[PDB]
Amino acid sequence: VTVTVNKNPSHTVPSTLYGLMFEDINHSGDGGLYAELLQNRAFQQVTPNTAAALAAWHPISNAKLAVIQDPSPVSNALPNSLQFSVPSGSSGRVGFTNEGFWGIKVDSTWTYKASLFFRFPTSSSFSGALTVGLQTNAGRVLAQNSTQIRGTTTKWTQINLELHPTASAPDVSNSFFVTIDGAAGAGQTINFAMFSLFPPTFKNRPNGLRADIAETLAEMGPSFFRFPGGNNLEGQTTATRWQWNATVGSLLDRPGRVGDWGYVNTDGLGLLEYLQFFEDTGMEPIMAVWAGYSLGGTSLAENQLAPYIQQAIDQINFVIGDPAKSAPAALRASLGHPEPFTLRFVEVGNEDFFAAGSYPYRWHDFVTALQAQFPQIRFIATTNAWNPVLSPVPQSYDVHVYQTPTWFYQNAFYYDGFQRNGTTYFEGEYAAISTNANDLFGTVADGRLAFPTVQSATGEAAFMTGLERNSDIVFAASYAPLLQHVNSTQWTPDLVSYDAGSVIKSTSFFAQKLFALNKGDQYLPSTLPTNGGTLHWSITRASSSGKTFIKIANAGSSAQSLTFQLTQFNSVSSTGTLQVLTGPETASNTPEAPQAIVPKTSTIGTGKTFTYNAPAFSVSVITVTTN
Ligand SMILES: *[C@@H]1O[C@H](CO)[C@@H](O[C@@H]2O[C@H](CO)[C@@H](O[C@@H]3O[C@H](CO[C@H]4O[C@H](CO)[C@@H](O)[C@H](O[C@H]5O[C@H](CO)[C@@H](O)[C@H](O)[C@@H]5O)[C@@H]4O)[C@@H](O)[C@H](O[C@H]4O[C@H](CO)[C@@H](O)[C@H](O)[C@@H]4O)[C@@H]3O)[C@H](O)[C@H]2NC(C)=O)[C@H](O)[C@H]1NC(C)=O
Ligand SMILES: *[C@@H]1O[C@H](CO)[C@@H](O[C@@H]2O[C@H](CO)[C@@H](O[C@@H]3O[C@H](CO)[C@@H](O)[C@H](O[C@H]4O[C@H](CO)[C@@H](O)[C@H](O)[C@@H]4O[C@H]4O[C@H](CO)[C@@H](O)[C@H](O)[C@@H]4O)[C@@H]3O)[C@H](O)[C@H]2NC(C)=O)[C@H](O)[C@H]1NC(C)=O
Ligand SMILES: *[C@@H]1O[C@H](CO)[C@@H](O[C@@H]2O[C@H](CO)[C@@H](O)[C@H](O)[C@H]2NC(C)=O)[C@H](O)[C@H]1NC(C)=O
Ligand SMILES: *[C@@H]1O[C@H](CO)[C@@H](O[C@@H]2O[C@H](CO)[C@@H](O)[C@H](O)[C@H]2NC(C)=O)[C@H](O)[C@H]1NC(C)=O
């Protein structure tokens, strides 16, 4: 096919076109991006005196363990404690382990920070060392540190000890441990609370993020980060919704919450940790506020909304307000960040198309209040576009789609026929999830993708060429979900996967990275792809340099050739770069073969006329200079 490139751009490509979508799903927060290594670290939101309350914790030797509603808790936000007892007649190390989130990576080049709170509930004559450390799951110590404690310590007391492993471990089958000498400790009971173990963090931020995952997200070149959900914003009930203020301040004051994916969230990954990560990566937020609906189907009545509207104002003031003018902004300053963070976009709810009978009044009352407080913020509606009809008129809508790979190439013209009437569109969740059009949310045996494939990435890439062509009205787009702990999965496929030690970059991750890192600020019209065809492209240009990015998706099973005609330009470079992602249709990166499918980069001859043979199932980027 001949592709003629117009020398005259038609529109500016928004800085926000490509970004990330985050909620805590598949242990993407706790167990994932958040660097904490201990699972169930503070017994949050579990029932005392049950096996489930002891999840992740195990005795060493003859230790007796129980999670209690402490009569004197470390904080009222953390009402549960681990009650540890050593039987009479004991000797040798006695204590307990935490298995982590399906393991702990033990690396000799890392310093770890361990901490805990303890008290003796009944004063005793105990005198001895409290040892903390890392061990193999077979019981051999890889790192330890200790401090002397006394049974007269009846007040809650924090222990802080660094760890330096004697060796990296051969695998991630390791645990954190706490022990005392069982002879010195025979007959003792100690209450513990608020444990923590951190590795080094991204940008050395206190309470920060896991380095390999954070670096992988930054590798993609995202411009925005949509958070904190997604379904995990909503709660099952009003009482279980995400609340910003429960996520800020000391970990001693963060109660945690049951999220929407079967597990407790610590809320250690809280609003300030999110915002610091944005600052550290150059991303800007698309921040959601809770909007009076939760996933059990209850909408708050209109006459109940006012306190929740104020909570959303408070959330936004934490991000951007002048510290002198509100308590939430003063709080941000008190926590070390007096400057406002960037915030241009706020999303009102999540997927309110499921609660469209109430969204008109919820949207009206939230946005009337929030826009008057923040005239400069753009508010994004979450119902289906234009049905129901909202007041005030939304400036933006968030569109979500989960579909087959084929649907994505077939629907690359989704936005071409939309009106240009001032509305912009955020494709806030999309992914090709299954080959079974009639059971998209089913099992792997019925066509669900366990991991992205070449097929799914290439169909997505064809749809993304349409997002980019239509970027006069499409301002932002993010794949979902972003992250997956391969040992605790609630949804597939996911963009980036990991276990306790390593990261897997999917086929779809490479398509996202190829699009985001090779994106100009000018859109150059070209011959249109066939509407419904397998072969699609989009051309952009960097105004400052003339770097010109030709992105090509062949989402079908046969090779196709393209003859590029750039004769309208004054000059085109004699060489260009080529980046190609391709492989078998159903190939994936997996924990067993994590680099099965990776892009290949080369240099090729170009000029005002050149030809490219696009392999079956490929995503390609050709970069030339034009003027
Ligand atoms: C920018 O441009 C867009 C596109 O033109 C404008 O979008 C239109 O907005 C109006 C509201 O302002 C929508 O009107 C409502 O239409 C429904 C009937 O919907 C059905 O028929 C429509 C054709 O008339 C059709 O477009 C619809 O298709 C959509 O939904 C289906 C799936 O549902 C989907 O398959 C399509 O892809 C579309 O997503 C649909 O089949 C009607 O019932 C409404 O009437 C109620 O509301 C009015 C006003 O309050 C009231 O007077 C009535 O009494 C009644 O209570 C209403 O007329 C129209 O659907 C939108 N079109 C599309 C294509 O989305 C948009 O308004 C522009 N914005 C700006 C800022 O100018
Ligand atoms: C995150 O922030 C949200 C707000 O955005 C917090 O949620 C709000 O929490 C408050 C406090 O729980 C709550 O206000 C109460 O509503 C109660 C239920 O209606 C009222 O009974 C209660 O009034 C009593 O307490 C006030 C002090 O809080 C008094 O000043 C008032 O006179 C009442 O006093 C009676 O009761 C108290 C015991 O509560 C007793 O000591 C007195 O002697 C007297 O008998 C409050 O007004 C809001 O309704 C919540 N709002 C929303 C939107 O959820 C949330 O708790 C924060 N999370 C964290 C972790 O801090
Ligand atoms: C045991 O933990 C303590 C406390 O973290 C470690 O001491 C710190 O060591 C660092 C590195 O030298 C110093 O910068 C701090 O000033 C020390 N703090 C205190 C309170 O002493 C100690 O190194 C650890 N020991 C082992 C064997 O890991
Ligand atoms: C976490 O998931 C990983 C990846 O699936 C598991 O490791 C695989 O385990 C199977 C069965 O033991 C082996 O046949 C594979 O070769 C393993 N793959 C890799 C890449 O190591 C791991 O066992 C899981 N961890 C837990 C604790 O369940």
Q: Specify whether the CB–CB gap between 123 and 220 falls below 8 A.
A: no
Strand (E) or helix (H) holding 582: strand 575-582
Method of determination? X-ray
DSSP E strand stretches across 32-126:
57-60, 64-69, 80-85, 93-98, 112-119
* Ligand 4, atom nearest to 486 Cα: 2
CB atoms within 10 A of CB 300: 17
CA distance 127 to 149: 6
Nearest CA to ligand 4 atom 23: 487
Give ranges for CATH 3.20.20.80 in the chain. Answer: 20-33+204-519
Partners of 484 in beta bridges? 497
Closest ligand 1 atom to Cα of 393: 71
* Residue whose entry in the numeric block shows the structure tokens 């608020």: 194
Which residue ranges does the chain devote to CATH 2.60.120.260? 52-198
Nearest to 470 by CA among 404, 437, 425: 425
Beta bridge mates, 130: 147
The tally of CA atoms less than 13 A away on the side-chain side of residue 603 is 4
Token pair of 300, please? 């708050």
- CATH number for the domain formed by residue range(s) 20-33+204-519: 3.20.20.80
Residue 195 CB neighbour total at 10 angstroms:
25
Measured in whole angstroms, the distance separating CA 122 from the mean position of its chain's CA atoms is 44
Q: How many residues are present in the chain? A: 627
Are 551 and 526 a contacting pair, CB within 8 Å?
Answer: no
Q: Is the peptide bond before 481 cis (omega within 30 degrees of 0)?
A: yes
In CATH terms, the fold of domain 52-198 is Jelly Rolls (2.60.120)
- Residue to mutate (ligand 4; options 97, 487, 488; most atoms within 8 A of CB): 487
Q: What angle do CA 228, 230, 234 make, to 5 degrees?
A: 85
> Contacts from 296-300 at CB under 8 Å and sequence distance 24+?
296/236, 296/237, 297/355, 298/237, 298/238, 299/355, 299/357, 299/358, 299/362, 300/238, 300/358, 300/362
Other C-beta atoms within 10 Å of 563: how many? 12
**Annotated active-site positions, please?**
351
| Cα(436)–Cα(433) distance, integer angstroms | 9
Residues 6+ apart with CB under 8 A from 363: 291, 348, 349, 352, 381, 383, 390, 391, 394
- For 14, the token pair is 């928004």
Question: What's the CA gap between 11 and 200, in Å, rounded?
Answer: 44
**493: preceding bond cis by omega (within 30 degrees):** yes
All CATH 2.60.40.1180 domain ranges of the chain, comma separated, are 2-12+523-625
Q: How far apart are the first and last CA of the chain?
A: 24
Cα 21–24–396 angle (5° rounding)? 30
Q: Exposed (0-12), middle (13-18) or buried (19+): which is 51, by Cβ within 10 Å? A: exposed
Residue with token string 């001949």: 2
Instruction: At 92, list the tokens.
Output: 């040798």
The resolution in angstroms reads: 1.2
Distance CA 239, CA 308 (A): 12
Between strands 522-523 and 503-505, the pairing is: unpaired
CA distance 446 to 453: 16
How far apart CA 32 and CA 466 sit, in angstroms, is: 32
Q: Which amino acid is at 50?
A: T
d(CA 28, CA 35): 11
Ligand 2 atom having least distance to the Cα of 246:
60
Tokens of 187: 């007959």
Residue 365, ligand 4, Cβ within 6 A: no
**Nearest-5° Cα angle at 386, 382 to 390:** 75
How far, in Å, are 37, 82, 251, 301, 306 from residue 54 at the CA level?
Answer: 16, 8, 20, 39, 39
| Residue 615 neighbours by CB under 8 Å, 6+ apart | 554, 559, 580, 582
**Cβ–Cβ under 8 Å, residues 128 and 73:** no
Q: Domain 2-12+523-625 belongs to what architecture?
A: Sandwich (2.60)
Distance from the alpha carbon of residue 295 to the mean position of ligand 2, in angstroms:
24
- Rounded CA-CA distance 219/212 in Å is 10
**Are the CB atoms for 233 and 172 separated by under 8 Å?**
no
- 18: tokens are 């490509």
Q: Which of 26, 39, 97, 102 to mutate to test the pocket of ligand 4 (most atoms within 8 A of CB)?
A: 102
Torsion on CA atoms 425, 426, 432, 433, rounded to nearest 10: -130
Query: Is 151 close to ligand 2, i.e. is its CB under 6 Å away?
Result: no
Angstrom distance (rounded) from CA 89 to CA 546: 79
Per-residue tokens: 335: 């926590």
Residue the block writes with tokens 């540190």: 145
For ligand 3, whether the C-beta of 145 sits within 6 Å is yes
Structure tokens of 540? 């952009």
**Residue 580 and residue 599 in contact, taking contact as beta carbons nearer than 8 Å:** yes
User: Which of 501, 483, 503, 590 is CA-nearest to residue 37?
Assistant: 501
| Interatomic CA distance for residues 229 and 481, integer angstroms | 10
Check pocket membership of 420 for ligand 1, CB cut-off 6 A: no
